[PDB]
């Protein structure tokens, strides 16, 4: 059931960490992918694979899991992305076990059916990040590590007071999301709880003033970008917003809606705009991820189930293709040795299908219709315009900068005058690009099949803001 | 399901020629592409002959996947498939010895399939899908020869302007979704009838739709991106300027006629922008010394004509000019491509001349095209342009000054078309062309294109003569029509227009054979050569300042991270101020101890 798929990447990452060899990670990620796909199919509803086990009877803690429409496809997305990062990695530092551990942690994070288990995974996801950052790459590794870790922790620890207030002030007997949702929080008490939630979730969203931890994180990881891909998967902020933040304290969200929508708009614009000024791949991709998170948070905060479903779909797909771009930059490093955009121009003539892979990925990034980005982008646009037209319009002065930075990077990296000549593709990279394009096309052209579980949650939690 | 094959064929073709692609002989990619285009023309003609078609598939909740094949969609489909088959043959001939044959024809197939996705649409998001797919294929083909950085930034600029237009499109669609909640042109029309609500918001949505149309069809101010499409090969420029990627601007208005007709002010604005676009294109065409640019500015002028037609509510008239133009401009481009194929890609005018005798079957193509564009009294271009000139007065909103404006534009089109023909084919010789100027299979579809250009013609004729296009175009969409007409005086106007066009032709003849270019004309030709100094201003206050702001926001982000650093440093400094509290003098520790204990004892009350 759910716990099996949640733990499989954890146990495989352990067996790669202490045990040998690297190859165990490829087959482990494949087994995870197949299990998460099987869980994604035949999904009846939320209780699909429900798990309930007691841990602290007195304190009220229970292992609580289940596959919602959201948990299923996010499991599938994570399994797929980490499998891709597992085959193509080329890190081979024997630490892909850390990548599988982080995968399993993010799985448990998403599948949490009770508040405290979610909080536990939210705090646990910090350790592998600092680990694969510190000992596996980067010159400013220590400083970026401290910055990112301290930001996450300064956000997270007061959220413990927030969750303690949310449980105690509501008289909810347990930490179960069912029970906690059964007992609402009052005015000027849901206010403070939501404020403590919004700090920890915005600094991890990321929004504009709280994003300063993102570029240093992405720069000094392993140059291959496996750690970077998993950190982009670590932008789970929006998710916690929609399921936990807003439904548990909409009274404060009433005053905070405009502020948060504005932050999402300006964050998206700022990221997609600065990404033009980026002189390296890590900076560009970090600012792009910031823009996408701004869009997703905008869609969720706008109410308007259109916007919410768009935000979540865009979140999953952006995680997928941003992780793909990170791994691609790492592979081009391993074959070349640099991530600068100006140098190494002739790539296109030497790289037959790596050019096409990078192009498909950047197209999915700028949100091209037919690929994964556009459904979420447009649904979020609709929902935001429903909520507040002004911030939606400003926020979508982003596709312009999206095309600008993506095309500039692609052109000056591949198109221009022939250089020395570069390796074409590796055998693992073949399956990588094939599966990447397959998933992108399937998620972009057929958004009907995916995200069907997202519609009920969207409309229910959007009507919840009403009477 | 059968209708989807029209799109699917030049997608499987694209996938074969892109993925494997070079596993084939040289002609085979073009062979497969042209064969798929032909067997798509066939299946579209067969489906239309069966009365029409509909297709609906499951998609985003509230936004399903809706394809509608009616008279209006089938019109564009037949045009695109036929001209695409002709240009595909012309590329099979024209593309030679340059790598990427398979890639090139895969781009062709993808372009065709995406344009079909555009026209076959009962829902506006599918129209947007086609929009962005055509924009991507255009970016790809314009930068076909990647080894030159210069012919990359052109497609960069093209796609950027395209995405500005696409953002306007998206916002208008969000508007017409917040209002109604349908976003399917069928039910959108069935819901827009009757008691309109919030007319301000409706006019705003239509204005944003027109903004998207401007970027797609390169109207003012977004004109500037089109000439740079000269970077791509000549058949690419033909398919972009004649049959696709610009005609979509007119097709959007033709389908949204029900929206634009209840917007009088917006339609009048469209007419004004079309007139200005025609004026700019005509005034800035002849100053260009290159064939590709002097044709691109003419494309600007002719699209201005079409948008003038669709501005006053003359939708079938705009489609008439679209038909004639898609014939004769494709003719011009393929002729020019054959010409530079004779000179090895010389691609200049001042380095040309005296190609009349030396070029068989090509001077004829060039003369047919120049006469059709200039408005030779008995030619398709004359019928279209003067039908627009008449619809100016006959259709609503008055067309008072627009008539004389478009007439001057007809004069100027005659003049600069004669400039092109004269300066290219007559009155000197320079350069070299020994062996193989005229190819069979390039000029062979060009024969058919010249035939269609001549005889597009009489589909739409003054009411004594049969008007075939108007009854075909009105029922499918643009049903509401309120236009008067006249006779006797209408034919006096046709005669005045024909005489004016002939005077413009001979005026260009004498002025551009003269080669003297007096004082003022040199200044004017220089100004037109520099596109009336538009890009100089566009990069002055817009593009480079946006770059400066991007860099400024980068510096500001660095500064924000520096402020976070300062917070941490304040924390450490406070920490060592508190760690300084313990010096080691026991008297100090005892005093601070007793002090803290006394503070505690006071707090307890």
UniProtKB/Swiss-Prot annotation, chain A:
Its main location: membrane. GO terms for cellular component: plasma membrane. It is an enzyme of class 7 (translocase). It comes from the Bacteria. Its EC number is 7.1.1.-. The keyword DNA damage does not apply. It is found in: Cell inner membrane. The chain crosses the membrane at residues 1-21, 23-43, 47-67, 69-89, 91-111, 115-135, 144-164, 190-210, 258-278, 284-304, 308-328, 354-374, 390-410, 430-450. Keywords: Cell inner membrane, Cell membrane, Membrane, NAD, Quinone, Translocase, Transmembrane, Transmembrane helix. Coiled coil: none annotated. It is a multi-pass membrane protein. GO terms for biological process: ATP synthesis coupled electron transport; electron transport coupled proton transport. It catalyses: a quinone + NADH + 5 H(+)(in) = a quinol + NAD(+) + 4 H(+)(out). GO terms for molecular function: NADH dehydrogenase (ubiquinone) activity; ubiquinone binding. The keyword Transmembrane applies. PANTHER family: NADH-UBIQUINONE OXIDOREDUCTASE CHAIN 4. Belongs to the complex I subunit 4 family. NDH-1 shuttles electrons from NADH, via FMN and iron-sulfur (Fe-S) centers, to quinones in the respiratory chain. The immediate electron acceptor for the enzyme in this species is menaquinone. Couples the redox reaction to proton translocation (for every two electrons transferred, four hydrogen ions are translocated across the cytoplasmic membrane), and thus conserves the redox energy in a proton gradient required for the synthesis of ATP. NDH-1 is composed of 15 different subunits, Nqo1 to Nqo15. The complex has a L-shaped structure, with the hydrophobic arm (subunits Nqo7, Nqo8 and Nqo10 to Nqo14) embedded in the membrane and the hydrophilic peripheral arm (subunits Nqo1 to Nqo6, Nqo9 and Nqo15) protruding into the bacterial cytoplasm. The hydrophilic domain contains all the redox centers. This is NADH-quinone oxidoreductase subunit 13. It comes from Thermus thermophilus (strain ATCC 27634 / DSM 579 / HB8). The gene is nqo13.
Swiss-Prot record, chain B:
Gene3D superfamilies: 1.20.5.2700. Its EC number is 7.1.1.-. It is found in: Cell inner membrane. It is a multi-pass membrane protein. NCBIfam families: NDH_I_L (TIGR01974), PRK06590.1 (NF005141). The chain crosses the membrane at residues 1-21, 29-49, 75-95, 104-124, 126-146, 165-185, 206-226, 234-254, 266-286, 303-323, 325-345, 364-384, 397-417, 441-461, 492-512, 584-604. Keywords: Cell inner membrane, Cell membrane, Membrane, NAD, Quinone, Translocase, Transmembrane, Transmembrane helix. This is NADH-quinone oxidoreductase subunit 12. Belongs to the complex I subunit 5 family. It comes from Thermus thermophilus (strain ATCC 27634 / DSM 579 / HB8). NDH-1 is composed of 15 different subunits, Nqo1 to Nqo15. The complex has a L-shaped structure, with the hydrophobic arm (subunits Nqo7, Nqo8 and Nqo10 to Nqo14) embedded in the membrane and the hydrophilic peripheral arm (subunits Nqo1 to Nqo6, Nqo9 and Nqo15) protruding into the bacterial cytoplasm. The hydrophilic domain contains all the redox centers. InterPro entries: NADHpl_OxRdtase_5_subgr, ND/Mrp_TM, NU5C-like, Proton_antipo_N.
